[PDB]
Design a protein around this ligand. Structure first.
Ligand SMILES: O=c1ccn([C@@H]2O[C@H](COP(=O)(O)OP(=O)(O)O[C@H]3O[C@H](CO)[C@@H](O)[C@H](O)[C@H]3O)[C@@H](O)[C@H]2O)c(=O)[nH]1
Length: 456
């Protein structure tokens, strides 16, 4: 529906929304209420190859000067629900009993203890993760890193049929609201005052990343490039692969580079994105942004990102949750670029199949970094697919007495009730399928190479 003044009225009726939230929400709604025959590929001048960038000098002074201007920030608004875990997704243990946050903290600690810098870490969480995060972060109280947190905007989900805020019908508990996407990082950094708290200290850029992307580590070649070339925004993209279905690509449109996402794509064109031909790059959501520019553009209300409707059905009630993507803000910044980086900077962990990959001998932890085995000569990881039986992390761990060796694996598909013993080795293309009513136990020490195991 589209009665806007009617919508504003109800929004102001919702007392728990702060004034700044009511405003930002109404602006989104207002704007809510793609000539494919023009889409272009960005030139190499706009999307710079990382290998062409100049590394820092041997004098640590240059490193300290750059680090003294930096603030690191992570995206932590999500829960561990997909992987059968309660709490923030960042607090799931990924490698060696260390959580995603623990590894990110170690990494920055290693930076601060290494260079004598005091780069601060900022966590942007959601109401669906704030208090739990608040509790966990205290563990790092004496760590050599200042951990800052803040909550991004809390907006009312909108009932789609009648177009009114769900809280107005009385859905005022947690399921009545939602965080408006990571694009909200810009106004929320302002609303939180952290931006002004960092500007009063000297920071100039924020490195933004998904909390569950293990490949998102600080890269000095990239930070250097933005400083010397005055790039106010840099989006790390990676070559698009068959695995990259759900996400965005960077495109040139109207002579500027911009994120292209599914809502903007005409019906008769959805598989071309999926292709490996038309679009050859894919956003990793590792974003580098200039802080003064964020302040300037948020206060001027310039960040007009495309809306992502994300519809859901809760308790039966079909609702709409309008959101935005951080990468879509790239078209509003000056001298903005994409940098095409190797997939080692893009290791998302979204299912227990990814944990199998990261807990196996394909990787090891090195000073807080999940480091790929170099004995793996072929860059690509093995494709791993596990049935629902492996969905909950605890059940996944119960089903692998030890994580099997997969350095020599091309692909593993597991289905049905399957339990694995310790010290197993898997090579090539492997499948294990237990039929209904059957439980399959892979004994300890088994070597499975290019085999289809369909029963005892
Ligand atoms: O309201 C929200 C929405 C998400 N997140 C966090 O944002 C991160 C990214 O979200 P996620 O759903 O994992 O990914 P998408 O938003 O689908 O994609 C992002 O990340 C992909 C790289 O993994 C890029 O290709 C896409 O351009 C970029 O939008 C996660 O850590 C979330 O915790 C928030 O902080 N707040």
């Amino acid at each position: 529906t589209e009665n806007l003044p009617q919508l504003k009225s109800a929004v102001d009726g919702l007392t728990e929304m702060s004034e700044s939230e009511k405003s930002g929400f109404i602006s989104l709604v207002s704007r809510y209420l793609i000539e494919w025959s023009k889409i272009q590929t960005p030139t190499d001048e706009i999307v710079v190859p990382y290998e062409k960038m100049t590394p820092v000098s041997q004098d640590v002074a240059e490193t300290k000067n750059l680090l003294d201007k930096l603030v690191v920030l992570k995206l932590n608004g999500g829960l561990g629900t997909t992987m059968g875990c309660t709490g923030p997704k960042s607090v799931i243990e990924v490698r060696d009993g260390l959580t995603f946050l623990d590894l990110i903290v170690i990494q920055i600690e290693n930076l601060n203890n290494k260079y004598g810098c005091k780069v601060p870490l900022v966590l942007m969480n959601s109401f669906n993760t704030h208090d739990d995060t608040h509790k966990i972060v205290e563990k790092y109280t004496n760590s050599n890193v200042d951990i800052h947190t803040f909550n991004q905007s809390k907006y009312p989900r909108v009932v789609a049929d009648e177009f009114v805020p769900w809280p107005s019908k009385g859905k005022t508990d947690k399921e009545g609201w939602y965080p408006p996407g990571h694009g909200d990082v810009f106004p929320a950094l302002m609303n939180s005052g952290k931006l002004d708290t960092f500007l009063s200290q000297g920071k100039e850029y924020v490195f933004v990343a998904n909390s569950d992307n293990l490949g998102a580590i600080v890269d000095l070649t990239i930070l250097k490039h933005l400083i010397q070339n005055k790039n106010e925004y840099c989006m790390e993209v990676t070559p698009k692969t068959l695995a990259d279905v759900k996400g965005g690509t960077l495109i040139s449109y109207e002579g500027k580079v911009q994120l292209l996402e599914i809502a903007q794509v005409p019906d008769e064109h959805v598989n071309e994105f999926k292709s490996i031909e038309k679009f050859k790059i894919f956003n990793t959501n590792n974003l580098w942004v200039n802080l003064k520019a964020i302040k300037k553009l948020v206060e001027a209300d310039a960040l007009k990102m495309e809306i992502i409707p994300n519809p859901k059905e809760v308790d039966g009630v079909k609702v709409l949750q309008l959101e935005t993507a951080a990468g879509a803000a790239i078209r509003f910044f000056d001298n903005a670029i994409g940098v095409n980086v190797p997939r080692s900077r893009f290791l998302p962990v979204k299912a227990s199949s990814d944990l199998l990959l990261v807990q196996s001998d394909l990787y090891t932890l090195v000073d807080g970094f999940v480091t790929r085995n170099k004995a793996r000569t072929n860059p690509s990881n093995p494709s791993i697919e596990l049935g629902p039986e492996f969905k909950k992390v605890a059940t996944f761990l119960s089903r692998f007495k030890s994580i099997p060796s997969i350095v020599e694996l091309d692909s593993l598909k597991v289905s049905g009730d399957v339990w694995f013993g310790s010290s197993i080795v898997l090579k090539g293309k492997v499948t294990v399928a237990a039929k209904s009513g059957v439980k399959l136990e892979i004994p300890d020490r088994a070597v499975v190479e290019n085999k289809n195991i369909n029963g005892p």
